[PDB]
Design a protein around this motif. Structure first.
Motif, PDB file in Angstrom:
ATOM      1  N   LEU A 130     -17.510  27.885   0.792  1.00 26.28           N
ATOM      2  CA  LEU A 130     -18.565  27.875  -0.214  1.00 26.28           C
ATOM      3  C   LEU A 130     -18.807  29.280  -0.817  1.00 26.28           C
ATOM      4  O   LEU A 130     -18.585  30.307  -0.120  1.00 26.28           O
ATOM      5  N   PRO A 131     -19.224  29.352  -2.108  1.00 22.83           N
ATOM      6  CA  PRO A 131     -19.336  30.693  -2.702  1.00 22.83           C
ATOM      7  C   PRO A 131     -20.494  31.502  -2.163  1.00 22.83           C
ATOM      8  O   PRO A 131     -21.437  30.955  -1.571  1.00 22.83           O
ATOM      9  N   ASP A 132     -20.403  32.809  -2.402  1.00 22.07           N
ATOM     10  CA  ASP A 132     -21.292  33.830  -1.880  1.00 22.07           C
ATOM     11  C   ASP A 132     -22.105  34.329  -3.076  1.00 22.07           C
ATOM     12  O   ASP A 132     -21.544  34.839  -4.052  1.00 22.07           O
ATOM     13  N   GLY A 161     -26.352  23.279 -12.357  1.00 25.56           N
ATOM     14  CA  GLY A 161     -26.986  22.560 -11.228  1.00 25.56           C
ATOM     15  C   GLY A 161     -28.226  23.272 -10.692  1.00 25.56           C
ATOM     16  O   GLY A 161     -29.133  22.606 -10.171  1.00 25.56           O
ATOM     17  N   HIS A 162     -28.307  24.601 -10.881  1.00 23.96           N
ATOM     18  CA  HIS A 162     -29.479  25.381 -10.499  1.00 23.96           C
ATOM     19  C   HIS A 162     -30.695  25.149 -11.407  1.00 23.96           C
ATOM     20  O   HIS A 162     -31.790  25.633 -11.140  1.00 23.96           O
ATOM     21  N   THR A 163     -30.505  24.348 -12.455  1.00 23.36           N
ATOM     22  CA  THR A 163     -31.661  23.894 -13.241  1.00 23.36           C
ATOM     23  C   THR A 163     -32.680  23.051 -12.426  1.00 23.36           C
ATOM     24  O   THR A 163     -33.840  22.926 -12.827  1.00 23.36           O
ATOM     25  N   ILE A 164     -32.280  22.518 -11.252  1.00 26.30           N
ATOM     26  CA  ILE A 164     -33.267  21.919 -10.344  1.00 26.30           C
ATOM     27  C   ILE A 164     -33.223  22.653  -9.013  1.00 26.30           C
ATOM     28  O   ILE A 164     -32.144  23.141  -8.588  1.00 26.30           O
ATOM     29  N   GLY A 165     -34.379  22.770  -8.364  1.00 28.34           N
ATOM     30  CA  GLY A 165     -34.456  23.271  -7.013  1.00 28.34           C
ATOM     31  C   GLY A 165     -34.787  24.742  -6.958  1.00 28.34           C
ATOM     32  O   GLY A 165     -35.177  25.379  -7.962  1.00 28.34           O
ATOM     33  N   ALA A 166     -34.652  25.284  -5.765  1.00 24.78           N
ATOM     34  CA  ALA A 166     -35.130  26.628  -5.525  1.00 24.78           C
ATOM     35  C   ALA A 166     -34.395  27.181  -4.314  1.00 24.78           C
ATOM     36  O   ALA A 166     -33.857  26.397  -3.510  1.00 24.78           O
ATOM     37  N   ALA A 167     -34.345  28.527  -4.215  1.00 20.41           N
ATOM     38  CA  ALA A 167     -33.909  29.166  -3.001  1.00 20.41           C
ATOM     39  C   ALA A 167     -35.121  29.326  -2.069  1.00 20.41           C
ATOM     40  O   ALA A 167     -36.284  29.281  -2.537  1.00 20.41           O
ATOM     41  N   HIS A 168     -34.847  29.563  -0.788  1.00 21.09           N
ATOM     42  CA  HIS A 168     -35.900  29.727   0.236  1.00 21.09           C
ATOM     43  C   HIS A 168     -35.555  30.903   1.149  1.00 21.09           C
ATOM     44  O   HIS A 168     -34.441  30.946   1.716  1.00 21.09           O
ATOM     45  N   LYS A 169     -36.536  31.804   1.345  1.00 19.31           N
ATOM     46  CA  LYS A 169     -36.247  33.040   2.058  1.00 19.31           C
ATOM     47  C   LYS A 169     -35.836  32.785   3.526  1.00 19.31           C
ATOM     48  O   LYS A 169     -35.231  33.667   4.173  1.00 19.31           O
ATOM     49  N   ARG A 171     -33.889  30.234   4.345  1.00 24.39           N
ATOM     50  CA  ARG A 171     -32.556  29.624   4.313  1.00 24.39           C
ATOM     51  C   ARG A 171     -31.543  30.637   3.849  1.00 24.39           C
ATOM     52  O   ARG A 171     -30.957  31.305   4.672  1.00 24.39           O
ATOM     53  N   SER A 172     -31.300  30.776   2.549  1.00 23.68           N
ATOM     54  CA  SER A 172     -30.397  31.851   2.172  1.00 23.68           C
ATOM     55  C   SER A 172     -31.049  33.281   2.314  1.00 23.68           C
ATOM     56  O   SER A 172     -30.362  34.280   2.564  1.00 23.68           O
ATOM     57  N   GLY A 173     -32.360  33.368   2.064  1.00 24.20           N
ATOM     58  CA  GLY A 173     -33.055  34.687   1.931  1.00 24.20           C
ATOM     59  C   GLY A 173     -33.514  34.937   0.500  1.00 24.20           C
ATOM     60  O   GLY A 173     -34.547  35.588   0.295  1.00 24.20           O
ATOM     61  N   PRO A 205     -27.075  37.197  -8.105  1.00 17.31           N
ATOM     62  CA  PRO A 205     -25.924  37.938  -8.703  1.00 17.31           C
ATOM     63  C   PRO A 205     -24.801  36.985  -9.216  1.00 17.31           C
ATOM     64  O   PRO A 205     -24.254  37.212 -10.287  1.00 17.31           O
ATOM     65  N   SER A 206     -24.487  35.917  -8.472  1.00 13.99           N
ATOM     66  CA  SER A 206     -23.511  34.917  -8.950  1.00 13.99           C
ATOM     67  C   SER A 206     -23.892  34.255 -10.289  1.00 13.99           C
ATOM     68  O   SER A 206     -23.022  33.909 -11.092  1.00 13.99           O
ATOM     69  N   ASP A 207     -25.184  34.037 -10.536  1.00  8.14           N
ATOM     70  CA  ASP A 207     -25.621  33.501 -11.834  1.00  8.14           C
ATOM     71  C   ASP A 207     -25.401  34.587 -12.911  1.00  8.14           C
ATOM     72  O   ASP A 207     -24.870  34.311 -14.026  1.00  8.14           O
TER      73      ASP A 207
HETATM   74  C1  HEM Z   1     -21.705  29.240  -8.375  1.00  7.01           C
HETATM   75  C2  HEM Z   1     -21.730  29.368  -7.031  1.00  7.01           C
HETATM   76  C3  HEM Z   1     -23.031  29.086  -6.289  1.00  7.01           C
HETATM   77  C4  HEM Z   1     -23.700  29.908  -5.475  1.00  7.01           C
HETATM   78  C5  HEM Z   1     -23.367  31.374  -5.142  1.00  7.01           C
HETATM   79  C6  HEM Z   1     -24.871  29.200  -5.025  1.00  7.01           C
HETATM   80  C7  HEM Z   1     -25.852  29.712  -4.193  1.00  7.01           C
HETATM   81  C8  HEM Z   1     -27.038  29.062  -3.904  1.00  7.01           C
HETATM   82  C9  HEM Z   1     -28.089  29.590  -3.048  1.00  7.01           C
HETATM   83  C10 HEM Z   1     -28.067  30.982  -2.341  1.00  7.01           C
HETATM   84  C11 HEM Z   1     -29.064  28.686  -3.018  1.00  7.01           C
HETATM   85  C12 HEM Z   1     -30.382  28.808  -2.232  1.00  7.01           C
HETATM   86  C13 HEM Z   1     -30.319  28.004  -0.916  1.00  7.01           C
HETATM   87  C14 HEM Z   1     -31.709  28.164  -0.299  1.00  7.01           C
HETATM   88  O1  HEM Z   1     -32.106  29.332   0.003  1.00  7.01           O
HETATM   89  O2  HEM Z   1     -32.438  27.159  -0.127  1.00  7.01           O
HETATM   90  C15 HEM Z   1     -28.682  27.544  -3.849  1.00  7.01           C
HETATM   91  C16 HEM Z   1     -29.462  26.422  -4.057  1.00  7.01           C
HETATM   92  C17 HEM Z   1     -29.088  25.325  -4.786  1.00  7.01           C
HETATM   93  N1  HEM Z   1     -27.806  25.083  -5.314  1.00  7.01           N
HETATM   94 FE1  HEM Z   1     -26.375  26.593  -5.653  1.00  7.01          FE
HETATM   95  N2  HEM Z   1     -24.833  27.911  -5.548  1.00  7.01           N
HETATM   96  C18 HEM Z   1     -23.739  27.798  -6.371  1.00  7.01           C
HETATM   97  C19 HEM Z   1     -23.296  26.646  -7.022  1.00  7.01           C
HETATM   98  C20 HEM Z   1     -23.918  25.423  -7.050  1.00  7.01           C
HETATM   99  C21 HEM Z   1     -23.387  24.181  -7.597  1.00  7.01           C
HETATM  100  C22 HEM Z   1     -21.944  24.047  -8.163  1.00  7.01           C
HETATM  101  C23 HEM Z   1     -24.371  23.254  -7.500  1.00  7.01           C
HETATM  102  C24 HEM Z   1     -24.404  21.747  -7.885  1.00  7.01           C
HETATM  103  C25 HEM Z   1     -23.841  21.353  -9.074  1.00  7.01           C
HETATM  104  C26 HEM Z   1     -25.529  23.895  -6.901  1.00  7.01           C
HETATM  105  C27 HEM Z   1     -26.732  23.267  -6.625  1.00  7.01           C
HETATM  106  C28 HEM Z   1     -27.796  23.862  -5.995  1.00  7.01           C
HETATM  107  C29 HEM Z   1     -29.139  23.269  -5.914  1.00  7.01           C
HETATM  108  C30 HEM Z   1     -29.602  21.950  -6.527  1.00  7.01           C
HETATM  109  C31 HEM Z   1     -29.984  24.230  -5.124  1.00  7.01           C
HETATM  110  C32 HEM Z   1     -31.472  24.088  -4.747  1.00  7.01           C
HETATM  111  C33 HEM Z   1     -31.526  23.457  -3.382  1.00  7.01           C
HETATM  112  C34 HEM Z   1     -32.996  23.254  -2.991  1.00  7.01           C
HETATM  113  O3  HEM Z   1     -33.876  23.192  -3.885  1.00  7.01           O
HETATM  114  O4  HEM Z   1     -33.303  23.161  -1.774  1.00  7.01           O
HETATM  115  N3  HEM Z   1     -25.216  25.206  -6.620  1.00  7.01           N
HETATM  116  N4  HEM Z   1     -27.431  27.805  -4.372  1.00  7.01           N
END
Ligand code: HEM
Ligand code: HEM
Lengths: 248, 248
Positions: A130-132, A161-169, A171-173, A205-207
């Motif tokens: 999975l990506p970093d 896909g990041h248009t929904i949801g959130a990071a959590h300190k 979980r990832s930090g 940074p990946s975004d």
């Molecule tokens: C481009 C590489 C990506 C990286 C580096 C990345 C990294 C991350 C990280 C660090 C989080 C936060 C996790 C947490 O702290 O709860 C996250 C959340 C999330 N990711 Fe990404 N991600 C990537 C690609 C994707 C893809 C391809 C999808 C789906 C199409 C996706 C969907 C999501 C969703 C929906 C969340 C929110 C989860 C939640 O609300 O609990 N991500 N991602």
């Protein structure tokens, strides 16, 4: 390049019934983002060169759950288990991918086509595919391109896909939502990415790496200007993602 | 099933010259056991089903050195580096396998045939493929049979590699030599295995597993009775091991 297998009429009927139960469950529980993360982490371990990893039910394994990247996906698995027990004929592989398609639909996104027939495989892939979040455009191409076999267009659209949801300190930090409407699937991720930092909102940074890449950037621009175009390319990329290693 | 590649006359000449330098070095330094461990850990990560891992120079990678199983193999790599610098035309893959063949020869074992031509590959296999000393006959068959593709006979004969060297409590945690003559390659491992525990001497659970298996045990018996037969089957198995994934 896909030849989808035949599943019985009873299998198809359980897909249709689980699809509906998944909409109601995911909407009421407000867990679409987590469910889309479960489907992506299930699929995104596919390595084309060895044909290992990929969306084959193995994320429910304690061993894959152990992966640090999978922080809190044990919650996702737990939430789905009662519902899954109602559909014993479906593979976990199919059920998790169907939850991902439903998560996108019930938050207002495109209708990603779904084909059943994935088999539940005994061995989870190695950890670390999975990506970093701290790395950049070369790393994204290694991961989506060299391992999974997706295009540059797929990388940008799937990042949305990041248009929904959130990071959590815990979980990832990282911490917080990418958008002001984190349960609404729209092109806001790209709009916010472009406009720079704003209090309360996250950019990894990946975004940000998408902004400085000569190929990614014009796609960021296109999607921020045209949600219909984002939706078309998103559905294409999610479909391919959910089918990695399946029906080739 | 092997088709060995062509290497230049200069390549062949460096093999012959490095073979001789390796005898003198390994004998003076008393490091045959460590060198045979380096060659085996280099080779034993081969997975036949995906064709990854195997004796391709990747053990010198800090990342593979990091593997817990590889405890103290960083010493082996360090010891060989000056000598290797004298033979820049040889692949690390070949050089490490040649050190393993030499280690067996200079301690009095059979002459394992050697064919050059292995290429140094960029990616080390995932961690965890080497066997676990605390497990038994099913685990040995998973590791040597299902992953590497060796026979039941090869497992028993290769275990006789423990006729030289010792465990160390700061590396694996086990401690001590299997035999009273740990720099002499002979059938003593099997003799000691059969006669039970003796003060000062080591038997891992993985070694003892050979005693209770209906197929392994008659081989243990054969080798304890007939060192010539051990030597024949050892050379066959080491050769196959050193060539996993190479020239197929
Ligand atoms: C481009 C590489 C990506 C990286 C580096 C990345 C990294 C991350 C990280 C660090 C989080 C936060 C996790 C947490 O702290 O709860 C996250 C959340 C999330 N990711 Fe990404 N991600 C990537 C690609 C994707 C893809 C391809 C999808 C789906 C199409 C996706 C969907 C999501 C969703 C929906 C969340 C929110 C989860 C939640 O609300 O609990 N991500 N991602
Ligand atoms: C059957 C599965 C095996 C298991 C579970 C196993 C396990 C071990 C362990 C725990 C050690 C001690 C490491 C330390 O503490 O220093 C060791 C040492 C050693 N192994 Fe094995 N091993 C196996 C097979 C092999 C094979 C196939 C070979 C080569 C043909 C081999 C050659 C050696 C040698 C020469 C040493 C001594 C190294 C030294 O003196 O520093 N082993 N092994």
């Amino acid at each position: 390049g896909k030849s989808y297998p035949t599943v019985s009429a009873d299998y198809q009927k359980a897909v249709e019934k689980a699809k509906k139960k998944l909409r109601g469950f995911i909407a009421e529980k407000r867990c679409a983002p987590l469910m889309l993360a479960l489907a992506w982490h299930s699929a995104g371990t596919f390595d084309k060169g060895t044909k290992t990893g990929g969306p084959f039910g193995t994320i429910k394994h304690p061993a894959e759950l152990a992966h640090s990247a999978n922080n809190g996906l044990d919650i996702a698995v737990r939430l789905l288990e009662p519902l899954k027990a109602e559909f014993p004929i479906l593979s976990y592989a199919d059920f998790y991918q169907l939850a991902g398609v439903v998560a996108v639909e019930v938050t207002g996104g495109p209708e990603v086509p779904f084909h059943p027939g994935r088999e539940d495989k005994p061995e989870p892939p190695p950890e670390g595919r999975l990506p970093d979040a701290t790395k950049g455009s070369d790393h994204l191409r290694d991961v989506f391109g060299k391992a999974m076999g997706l295009t540059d267009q797929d990388i940008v659209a799937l990042s949305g896909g990041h248009t929904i949801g959130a990071a959590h300190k815990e979980r990832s930090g990282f911490e917080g939502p990418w958008t002001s409407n984190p349960l609404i699937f729209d092109n806001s991720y790209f709009t916010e990415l472009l406009s720079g930092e704003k209090e309360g909102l996250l950019q990894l940074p990946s975004d940000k790496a998408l902004l400085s890449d000569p190929v990614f950037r014009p796609l960021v621009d296109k999607y921020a200007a045209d949600e219909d175009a984002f939706f078309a390319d998103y559905a294409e990329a999610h479909q391919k993602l959910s089918e990695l290693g399946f029906a080739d």
